Amino acid sequence: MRVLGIETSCDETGIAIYDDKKGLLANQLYSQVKLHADYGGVVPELASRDHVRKTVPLIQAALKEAGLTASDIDAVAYTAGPGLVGALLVGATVGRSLAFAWNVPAIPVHHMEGHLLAPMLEDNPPEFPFVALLVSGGHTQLISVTGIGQYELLGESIDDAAGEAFDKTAKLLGLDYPGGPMLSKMASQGTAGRFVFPRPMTDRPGLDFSFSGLKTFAANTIRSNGGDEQTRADIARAFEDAVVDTLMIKCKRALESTGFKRLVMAGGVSANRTLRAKLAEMMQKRRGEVFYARPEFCTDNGAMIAYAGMVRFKAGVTADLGVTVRPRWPLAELPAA
Amino acid sequence: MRILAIDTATEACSVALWNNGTINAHFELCPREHTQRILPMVQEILAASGASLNEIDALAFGRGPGSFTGVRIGIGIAQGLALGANLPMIGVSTLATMAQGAWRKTGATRVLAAIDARMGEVYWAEYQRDAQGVWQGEETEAVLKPERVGERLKQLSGEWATVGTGWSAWPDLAGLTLHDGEVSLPAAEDMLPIASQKLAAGETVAVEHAEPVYLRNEVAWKKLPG
Ligand SMILES: Nc1ncnc2c1ncn2[C@@H]1O[C@H](COP(=O)(O)O)[C@@H](O)[C@H]1O
Missing domain, CATH: 3.30.420.40 (ATPase, nucleotide binding domain)
Known part of the structure; x- marks a missing residue:
């Protein structure tokens, strides 16, 4: 099974392809550090504009990186929140409409669960x-x-x-x-x-x-x-x-x-x-x-979203045609799998 | 040809399908419900005309200007669909779309389009339909203060129809003979004749080249000292 993950919650555009048999097949990242540095904090409008010019090209590069075609993807996972509404909406609209076009399930992922499950991507993952x-x-x-x-x-x-x-x-x-x-x-x-x-x-x-x-x-x-x-x-x-x-x-x-x-x-x-x-x-x-x-998967990346997306997809978490972003979304509110 | 058009740049949600002339369209006011309504509307308009997304020859999208959020919803949805189905894309001005709407509703060939952007400014354009049905005046698209618009109206002549929320926000802006265009918001069905002209001229873009037209590119944040 292969899941394409999309992360656009803050200042980083992260795209990854996670295969539950072979592991991580692609990992693409674009950081907007230089864009926001001069303002001493993330400017929501500038962050949203940059996710627009990087989401689609990075999905295209992740597919060519893993040497896969559209039909090799079984589901699309995207960060639905928490985060900046404007940035979240870029990855969520692209992600959900892509899943619709590819006729595959779409998985809304909680960004903090993504972080939490990032160590599950390493050898010897933790057991509950x-x-x-x-x-x-x-x-x-x-x-x-x-x-x-x-x-x-x-x-x-x-x-x-x-x-x-x-x-x-x-x-x-x-x-x-x-x-x-x-x-x-x-x-x-x-x-x-x-x-x-x-x-x-x-x-x-x-x-x-x-x-x-x-x-x-x-x-x-x-x-x-x-x-x-x-x-x-x-x-x-x-x-x-x-x-x-x-x-x-x-x-x-x-x-x-x-x-x-x-x-x-x-x-x-x-x-x-x-x-x-x-x-x-x-x-x-x-x-x-x-x-x-690993240090790269501690900060925002798409690998944690493709992974958490896969876990949620196996547990039955699927999105309907309506796109929904949750900028304030507590980790306690998410249902048990 | 088969063209699918979508629009979320303003307070409206709209989709339309062109099938070698025949048009199927749906329009609704969807304030704060854009993300909740657009894909169900696309799925419904495709199922209605028995069309598959893979058989579409071009995906027309509202490129802006308008709501920054709304314009990005429209481009996001269109990019996902076009990337997913390998579709050529056509960006259509929301200002030109409202000009086409005024022509469809009233027969107006000369349109003054004004969108009420926040901060008391408007997105402005002067559009004139030629003998071939092409709207001329794309180079006139700008973000202006109402005082600069009033000065510009003194430079123009003849009969014009007015469209957009800019005239709702500043109705005292109306030497010139002005008529109501009967359009406040763009509809995707009025994008289809513009997209049809553009597809015929081979003026389509690949999904990675689709870009929004914001007009207001100034940041509402100061940079750190020095
Ligand atoms: N090596 C590090 N030591 C301390 N803070 C760090 C380090 N790397 C990243 N951070 C912080 O982690 C945050 C970014 O991660 P996050 O909000 O979890 O996506 C920022 O507040 C960074 O300053």
Whole structure:
């Protein structure tokens, strides 16, 4: 079985072809970073216009990449939400009308489920049950996964998600939007323990998060110190170490509470080098296991949508002729499979 | 020939099919329901004329201008269908489509098309039908302030029919002899004679070349300091 996946929820056009026997057959990606950088954030109108010029050519390139023709595709999967209504609508209208024209089922996919299931694309995929740490731009959640579509929210952030906290501090460190990865590169040249940032919500028990106060601590530290590269790299490292220690403490607590032996990390922030090593080390001590997506499948791609689309198609999730986008769509609201 | 036309650039949802002259059409006001109504309308108009999507010779689409969202719904749906069925595509101006509608309804050969774009500006065009039924004046398509339109009306002469929501938004814009064109919104059935002329001239594009015509290309965001 072959599923074509379409991802256009934010600033990246992702097209992929996933075969449940042979694995990933094609993976195409166009990033709009340079388009939005100058505005310091994604301009919805500019993002929507760019998905229009890249969706159809990238579908055409993905088919020629995998050396397949139209009839080799059994279903079309597209991100229906959450995301930007304007960007979502590009992939959803192209995706649904393509499925109609090819006379194949169309699969609306939840973008966060896409991220969550991205580690299922690697060898030795996680078995249920597992604790999932979803660390994205807008969300930071601890989820109890007991099956596919069986997601129990254990904890979430009350303010900034870990990803936006990374972007906000990177802006203050003079980096271009989105600065999260560049902050992490700066941090790798940093001196351990030079500065010590707090770990919010870790004094009291509970699984909820808070990162807004790290932005303020960072801002005040930048102002109270010199502007040399080494100082800024030491602040970048102190910020990263605090976010990772916080995420590690909360993951530990969730594993204890649930009683689970498996931990899965997903979302853009799960690409972080320091987070991957610290969570790996903790699971080795617990005598458990960590599961990650490859770094490219941590951020927006179409492979996770073609994969999650295939799982939903096997469970009976099909779209009617009406196209529907859900810019606000909670992971808890999605039905169990 | 067989031509399928679709339009969602404005507050209306419309589809139409041309089969060597005979036309089957459907039009409806679908505010906030564009994505919910377009593919059921396509499936129904094809089933009605017993036509298969694979037998279509050209897919005509509302290229704009109009609602940015609406124009992108129309191009998205048309691109998926054309890519899926390997169909040549024909972009038809929403301004010229309303001119054709005014001619079909009133016999008007000289049309002043104005769409009420947000921010108090209008999408403007001066369209004149020639002896061959071709609407001339595509180079006049622009986004203008009503004051600039009023100045432009002083430069024109004769009898004109008015079409579009621009005249609803600014009815005090109406030296010239103006008549109501009886068209506020485009219909896909009025795209079919324009698409038929374009297909005959070999002026079709492949799916990857289909582009929207927004006219307003200015961003409603300032760039970061310096
Ligand atoms: N290596 C990294 N370290 C920290 N944050 C990252 C890294 N790579 C991506 N991100 C962040 O992850 C987010 C993008 O992922 P997402 O919202 O899950 O699609 C942004 O907030 C990025 O700054």
